[PDB]
Amino acid sequence: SNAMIRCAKKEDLNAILAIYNDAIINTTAVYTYKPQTIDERIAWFETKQRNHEPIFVFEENGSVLGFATFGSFRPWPAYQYTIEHSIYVDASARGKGIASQLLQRLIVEAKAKGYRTLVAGIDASNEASIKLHQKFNFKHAGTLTNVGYKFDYWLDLAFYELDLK
Amino acid sequence: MIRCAKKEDLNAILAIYNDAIINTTAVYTYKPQTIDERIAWFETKQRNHEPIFVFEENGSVLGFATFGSFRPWPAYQYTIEHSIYVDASARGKGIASQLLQRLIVEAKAKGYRTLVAGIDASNEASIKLHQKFNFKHAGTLTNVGYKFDYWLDLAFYELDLK
Amino acid sequence: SNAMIRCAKKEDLNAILAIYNDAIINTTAVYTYKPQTIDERIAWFETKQRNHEPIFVFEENGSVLGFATFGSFRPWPAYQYTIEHSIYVDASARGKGIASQLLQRLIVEAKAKGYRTLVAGIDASNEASIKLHQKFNFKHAGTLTNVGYKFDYWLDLAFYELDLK
Amino acid sequence: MIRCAKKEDLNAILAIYNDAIINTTAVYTYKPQTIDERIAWFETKQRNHEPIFVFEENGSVLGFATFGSFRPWPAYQYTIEHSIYVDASARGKGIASQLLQRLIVEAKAKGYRTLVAGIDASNEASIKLHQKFNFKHAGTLTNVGYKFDYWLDLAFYELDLK
């Protein structure tokens, strides 16, 4: 039972890709329709590396079972102390507290880099994610109704926020 | 008259925008925009077929308005975020209201479902205006911005276009 | 500026009544239609006294500007460590932090009496109350839709909860 | 057969109820009910015109069900909370489902808007049953109950009767 949270590396990308694409195909966790390609994912990784944005993976028994990152919330200079994060856990690996460990690590990194405000965009249907965020003292800041459309129904996006100060 | 913006409008638009940058929390930016960035913005919007409207009176552009993507993921397809800016010397004339009205007309015509405004929590006139046009307060993100040495709260207001 | 939070007394009831009835007439803060009578309010007070349930008032310059209490959440013996509270502030006295001071006092009393769980039933429209409760680390536990009917529209009741442990 | 309960049913009902008190988290009560309290409950429900249904088979009451007030304030007028109890020896027979079906029929006929179930978070069969009848999980209150030396979570499930 060799389990560890570490920064992601290039050799992780394929695993990461699979996880992400599963989420695209089966859930509203990603407001995307088409599976991402490996080149798109590699460009994403290189861009995160250039921007000094973290990517963490949860790895167990040689397998990447989850990943997490943060970056810009809205693209305007005065949002500089605000970041938005995302967390994805393999569907075969749920119930193991992997999301919780990833979020914990994200928060420690966010505090160490001096950000003020951490934002989660969570689909209103994502009950486990909402519960997890409430556990870490995120406050529900609002809900934008009918902002998304997927699987033939309208989607509501809830914003949760943590004051890192 | 409210008409679509043309390249010849750009300088005036820039001025309005930069005033808002320098003096208000209406734009979460610190440094003035340059005319080159504005021109690039214009051409990009022409390319994306996003509308830009100006309010013109006595040959002078007194306000402008536009809408575009709210968040950049494909499933946000039917959601747009709008922006309105009115010349500081042209307040009180109902310009922002006429622009918002025009934006809403354009948004319905193009088949969008949801129109979103990010309004600074202190912009009470804008809030009152959007309430008047039946926008609902969707929420408020606190301390999301930082300008003029203080923390800024962003209120989200939404209109269902259906 | 003589301001104080104290336990309520009989001589407070008239003031309390007015506040309550204002809330009945103008808001969804009380799922009641008809104004309460002074005898009903006195019976309420006597009952709270018999049950050792607290009633606090915020008093300033000789005037009761707010009141607050807690009691049973659901009537079955196994809910004994759970209480539900309510807070009412005079409409002429809003924005003074009176609700916040009352809630603070309620929480200290709840902890001192060994309860585990404090519950707020808040109308989904009551934004100030929701914000106040989030401030004191209540978690939104759920929302019952169309449970109430008042002023010709359907009402949603949100539950917020604080773990007192 | 599912019929309205009669006084002669009460003893059987009591047994069922008390079993649930003694062995499960289905009733947030510690001590067995007495037949006097049950009779008072029955007469009170007759008075309030609240329905009580029993599932009867081979002359034996194998389950019962009822609904009544959810919260005690006038504006909760169109909301009811229901309860279903099935004999422990009569599980697997679809009794709870037939009772719920009957309750829903009765609730619509009487013009209620919202039907509410308080279900212990560990009662997975009840949850699955209510999901089957299109109840929505409205929320969960954690640590609201205490029984058998542990903390209990109450899930609320709701059906819009319109």
Numbering used by the authors:
A (entry chain A), C (entry chain A): -2 to 162
B (entry chain B), D (entry chain B): 1 to 162
The publication says:
The Gcn5-related N-acetyltransferases (GNATs) are a very large enzyme superfamily with more than 10,000 members identified across all kingdoms of life. The GNATs catalyse the transfer of an acetyl group from acetyl CoA to the primary amine of substrates including antibiotics aminoglycosides, glucosamine-6-phosphate, histones, serotonin, spermine, spermidine, and other small molecules. Members of the family share a common fold known as the GNAT fold, comprised of 6–7 anti-parallel β-strands and 4 α-helices in the topology β1-α1-α2-β2-β3-β4-α3-β5-α4-β6-β7. Staphylococcus aureus, an important pathogenic and increasingly multi-drug resistant bacterium, contains 35 putative GNAT enzymes, many of which remain uncharacterised both functionally and structurally.
Here, we describe the 2.15 Å structure of a GNAT family member within S. aureus. SaGNAT protein crystals produced in 1 M sodium acetate trihydrate, 100 mM HEPES pH 7.5, and 50 mM cadmium sulphate diffracted to 2.15 Å and were indexed and integrated in the space group C2, with unit cell parameters a = 97.5 Å, b = 78.9 Å, c = 66.0 Å, α = 90°, β = 112.0°, γ = 90°. The refined x-ray crystallographic structure revealed SaGNAT to be an α/β protein comprised of 4 α-helices and 7 β-strands, with a topology β1-α1-α2-β2-β3-β4-α3-β5-α4-β6-β7. Two central antiparallel β-sheets (β1–4 and β5–8) are splayed between β4 and β5 to create a V-shape in the protein. The two β-sheets are held together at the V joint by hydrogen bonding located on the N-terminal residues in strands β4–β5, and diverge at Ser83 and Ala117. This signature feature of GNATs is stabilised by hydrogen bond interactions between water molecules and the amide N and carbonyl O atoms from the protein main chain. SaGNAT is likely to exist as a dimer based on the crystal structure, structural similarity with homologous proteins, and elution profiles from size exclusion chromatography. In the asymmetric unit of the crystal, two SaGNAT molecules were present with a buried surface area of 1,397 Å2, strongly suggesting that this interaction is biologically relevant. Briefly, the binding interface in comprised Ala75:Tyr28/Tyr146; Tyr30:Gln77; Arg71:Glu81; Thr140:Ala138; Thr114:Thr142/Asn143; Thr79:Val144; Thr142:Glu158; Asp160:Asn143. The structure confirms that the protein exhibits the core GNAT fold, and has high structural homology with phosphinothricin acetyltransferases.
